Write a protein that binds this ligand. Structure first.
Ligand SMILES: CCCCCCCCCCCC(=O)O
Ligand SMILES: CCCCCCCCCCCC(=O)O
Ligand SMILES: CCCCCCCCCCCC(=O)O
Ligand SMILES: CCCCCCCCCCCC(=O)O
Ligand SMILES: c1ccc2cnccc2c1
Ligand SMILES: c1ccc2cnccc2c1
Ligand SMILES: c1ccc2cnccc2c1
Ligand SMILES: c1ccc2cnccc2c1
Ligand code: NI
Ligand code: NI
Ligand code: NI
Ligand code: NI
Lengths: 142, 142, 142, 142
């Protein structure tokens, strides 16, 4: 219980500001932040299992399924099943998806970059691990 | 730059869930999280300077002014100027405000309490200090 | 299909502005717009059946149940069952609820009042009936 | 004043549902509803003045400027000045923008289409003109 009400007070105020900036980013890139991060993973590691994407995002497989369905609508990734093992679902960046992720890189919201440049690398790592833990608690993941 | 896109991906997903829970809390208590925290400060320390409230919330005086104007509309606090030093602005809980903060205590969103009970006290302290730093960066405070 | 994309474009832009004003109103009154309207109904007609509230709001009984649970948390209404016919659920304004609705009256967002004062009474009636129809379509009500 | 609180109650409930569906649409198409409608105008009439886009959206020129800046980030339109009259600002769909608007057509949110198919064409026209009037009142346009 301790620190909860103060954390929520700060999260509300920060979040109210961050939401405006994220709507700008969505307007400038055509992606929500989780969609963008998905594309970055696939850009980095190439074609990957949908279950690995879920693990990297700290969400359930079923949650990644919806995300991927939306990225398919935008034609940014392709989903397929391994030819012989149809249980293995592979997600892959399309040519469009690769161009979108690079464009999104350059069109990122600059106010958000400014705020986080005032946090040490080590402080960003701390926040990220706390968020990953919170996501795990919320989603019932590992 | 490192960790920024992953942090935003997680913040978006967590925030989407947290927003639903905060709307419930607003419906159940009649307060946003910063308004509730303000009332808790005034319940704890009694009548306090508006500038001290601003410091405790990591926001500018001008930001606290709007918050307090809204709490005055709900009749939960009273604002007055010291009788001889009219530069000193004091904020005080009303009888209504005291009843509201106690009621809000009991009617807090239980999903949020559940999530944060899975974080160590020390992890809550870490998140809180990171949020206070982020708020300071965003608001241009000390 | 015709007019749908234009309507959504306008609804998005209007809604983005209206959301800021509604958050102010929530801060100033401690009520969301449906909670406020519920209290106005109970102020006008006195104690009423929960099913009648649902009909007046164009929502399912189950939807009004959640709303009323939240108004009970804020202690603004009381729910009870008729003494002999326990199927009849009656909702009633408390002394607190009556004071809140009057206070909310005076603390209403003035920007919203300004916009709607530029619509004829007959245009407000048209919008209201279109919204009631849309609500009925969405909620599966009568 | 009459009908205002009821309209806001309904707008809040409808809007809460519509927001979820619009976030899906944004995920599925990479466009907010005003961005999509802009692209539809440019698809229909070809290259058009930025001032004409503003008129068609019932917003100020300055508002369309921001929208267009975001569509430029996504590379969906091109802005240029007439070669001899540099006061005349022309907006034009790119090859990417044309493909995006067609894709967006097919990936539109089906729940929204379902709701509006239950309104007569004449009722959609009424809502649209009321929204255009409301937008005009809010933006200070003609
Ligand atoms: C009825 C549609 C609701 C529209 C939701 C728009 C979301 C706006 C987010 C607030 C940030 C801003 O106002 O820029
Ligand atoms: C046009 C009015 C817009 C209404 C904003 C309501 C905010 C809803 C927040 C989303 C959470 C939920 O759907 O429960
Ligand atoms: C993580 C918590 C999210 C906070 C949601 C706040 C809603 C803000 C609505 C946008 C209007 C405004 O910015 O004034
Ligand atoms: C801190 C970032 C805030 C994230 C805003 C996400 C908007 C969610 C809109 C509510 C609809 C839904 O929950 O599906
Ligand atoms: C609190 C609330 C929202 C956030 C959004 N992005 C990064 C950090 C955040 C902290
Ligand atoms: C990220 C986004 C929103 C939050 C809201 N409350 C607590 C923690 C959070 C982390
Ligand atoms: C469109 C979108 C949101 C609204 C909110 N309140 C009144 C009218 C509206 C029209
Ligand atoms: C009220 C609130 C939001 C809306 C969004 N889209 C269409 C109609 C609407 C009416
Ligand atoms: Ni296949
Ligand atoms: Ni005084
Ligand atoms: Ni009883
Ligand atoms: Ni040029």
């Amino acid at each position: 219980m301790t620190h909860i009400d103060k954390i929520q007070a700060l999260a509300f105020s920060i979040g109210k500001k961050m939401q405006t900036e994220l709507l700008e980013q969505m307007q400038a890139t055509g992606l929500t932040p989780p969609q963008f991060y998905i594309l970055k993973i696939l850009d980095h590691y190439g074609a990957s299992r949908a279950t690995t994407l879920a693990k990297k995002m700290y969400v359930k497989p079923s949650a990644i399924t919806v995300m991927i369905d939306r990225l398919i609508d935008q034609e940014l990734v392709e989903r397929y099943h391994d030819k012989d093992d149809r249980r293995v679902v592979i997600i892959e960046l399309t040519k469009k998806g690769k161009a979108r992720v690079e464009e999104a890189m350059t069109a990122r919201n600059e106010h958000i970059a400014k705020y986080f440049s005032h946090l040490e690398l080590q402080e960003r790592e701390d926040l990220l691990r706390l968020f990953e833990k919170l996501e795990t608690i919320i989603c019932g993941t590992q």
